[PDB]
């Protein structure tokens, strides 16, 4: 039961999928049992609350119906209950984060970040403020209008970072101790032109942050200290430059970094992380099912689960703690268009 976790799968609902699918996943055997489901349009990204009692899921719509929903989650039965839905006021919300006081969405087509204060019952108050991203990048198709692709809380609980995808930079927001709405910083952290910064993650020790760039197919490593991101290294994640890189995660011991690639030679690039200076070096590559837009690693670090949207499976890989390399267990979880994997302990 200790190694039996609650797993939440987010999807695109244009196919046979009806929304969020819940499972009981064993982080020792890598076995999964279907539990329940919640009907919700395009919940492409979802996040559970720290206590695992609430789930916040986007409805990735390219219009005025674009929304964020709050759900009550029953950890033991895997059942979900819709509580409330509020508009994002920004098309294509594709990422969601929570610190328990507020909820954030990255509105890709809106080109904005929406900030939702949480209500005492865990439901969402309407989006209080939206913060505007910019379009200055040279990709005429992908960087034509502002796109926000990630909205993350800094591990010291004082800042918010957002990927300004079309302006090749990372936006910084200073959090207030009392107000759930942050202050926008006057300066952003610039990266190489034609990068398309997609997802940002912090190392388990909170001293480093790593960015996966969609267009340049790079992993960008940063030292992190009290709101300051300092670039220390750029490394190739996608050697065929398919301009379709997606997700990034470190193993919970912080020793290995994983970055996923789509469109061509779909798979996961594996890097060893230097303990003292946070630099990266490739250890291998894992070819996966088609379109690994999202993946996650179990809390014990024993398994890597890769959601392959076009293969309609979540592939279960056994992680070698020592080498960082992956072994397909061939215990595929069949879901139509899986695009988000979250765990609840």
Q: Say how far apart CA 247 and CA 228 lie, in whole Å.
A: 23
Of the candidates 233, 232, 192, the residue with the CA atom closest to the CA atom of residue 213: 192
Neighbours of 134 (CB within 10 A): 18
Which residue range is the domain that position 332 belongs to?
Answer: 1-345
Task: Output the six-digit token pair for 343.
Answer: 């765990």
Neighbours of 68 (CB within 10 A): 26
Q: Say how far apart CA 118 and CA 99 lie, in whole Å.
A: 10
Q: Say how far apart CA 316 and CA 322 lie, in whole Å.
A: 18
Q: Which residue has the tokens 């964020």?
A: 68
Task: Output the six-digit token pair for 56.
Answer: 């916040």
Q: Say how far apart CA 222 and CA 229 lie, in whole Å.
A: 6
* 180 burial type by CB count under 10 A (0-12 exposed, 13-18 middle, 19+ buried): middle
Q: What is the three-class DSSP state of 167?
A: helix
Task: Output the six-digit token pair for 149.
Answer: 């692709």
Q: How many domains does the chain fold into? A: 1
CATH assignment of the domain containing 159: 2.130.10.10
Name the β-bridge partners of 342.
8
Q: What Å resolution does this PDB entry report?
A: 2.2
Q: What is the three-class DSSP state of 133?
A: coil
> Taking the mean position of all CA atoms in its chain, how far away is CA 169?
18
Q: Which residue has the tokens 């986007």?
A: 58
Q: Spell out the alpha helix ranges (H) of the chain.
A: none
Checking DSSP bridges between strand 79-87 and strand 67-74, what pairing results, if any? antiparallel
**8 A C-beta contact, residue 142 and residue 166:** yes
Q: Say how far apart CA 148 and CA 337 lie, in whole Å.
A: 22
Q: What is the DSSP string of 199-237?
A: EEEE-TTSSEEEEEETTT-EEEEEEEETTEEEEEEEEES
């Amino acid at each position: 039961d200790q190694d039996e976790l609650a797993m939440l799968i987010g999807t695109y609902t244009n196919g046979s999928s009806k929304g969020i699918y819940t499972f009981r996943f064993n982080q020792e055997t890598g076995t999964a049992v279907p539990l329940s489901s919640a009907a919700l349009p395009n919940p492409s990204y979802l996040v559970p609350s720290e206590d695992g009692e609430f789930v916040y899921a986007v409805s990735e719509m390219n219009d005025s119906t674009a929304a964020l929903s709050s759900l009550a989650f029953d950890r033991e039965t895997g059942e979900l209950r819709l509580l409330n839905t509020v508009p994002t006021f920004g098309a294509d919300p594709c990422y969601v984060a929570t610190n328990g006081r507020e909820v954030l969405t990255a509105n890709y087509s809106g080109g904005t970040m929406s900030v939702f204060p949480l209500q005492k019952d865990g439901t969402l108050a309407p989006a209080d403020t939206l913060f505007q991203g910019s379009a200055t990048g040279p990709d005429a198709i992908r960087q034509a209008t502002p796109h926000i692709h990630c909205t993350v809380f800094s591990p010291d609980g004082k800042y918010i970072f957002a990927t300004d995808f079309s302006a090749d930079r990372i936006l910084r927001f200073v959090m207030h101790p009392d107000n759930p709405i942050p202050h926008a910083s006057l300066e952003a952290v610039g990266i190489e032109a034609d990068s398309g910064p997609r997802h940002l993650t912090f190392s388990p020790n909170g001293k480093f942050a790593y960015l996966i760039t969609e267009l340049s197919g790079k992993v960008i490593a940063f030292s992190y200290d009290d709101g300051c991101l300092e670039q220390i290294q750029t490394i190739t994640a996608d050697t065929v430059a398919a301009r379709g890189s997606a997700d990034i995660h470190l193993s919970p011991d912080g020793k290995y970094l994983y970055a996923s690639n789509r469109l061509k030679e779909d798979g996961i690039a594996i890097f060893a992380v230097n303990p003292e200076n946070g630099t990266l070096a490739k250890v291998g590559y894992q070819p996966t099912g088609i379109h690994p837009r999202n993946f996650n690693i179990t809390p014990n670090g024993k398994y890597l689960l890769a959601a392959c949207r076009d293969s309609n499976v979540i592939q279960v890989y056994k992680r070698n703690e020592v080498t960082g390399l992956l072994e397909d267990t061939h215990q595929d979880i069949v879901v139509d268009m899986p695009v988000c994997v979250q765990f609840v302990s």
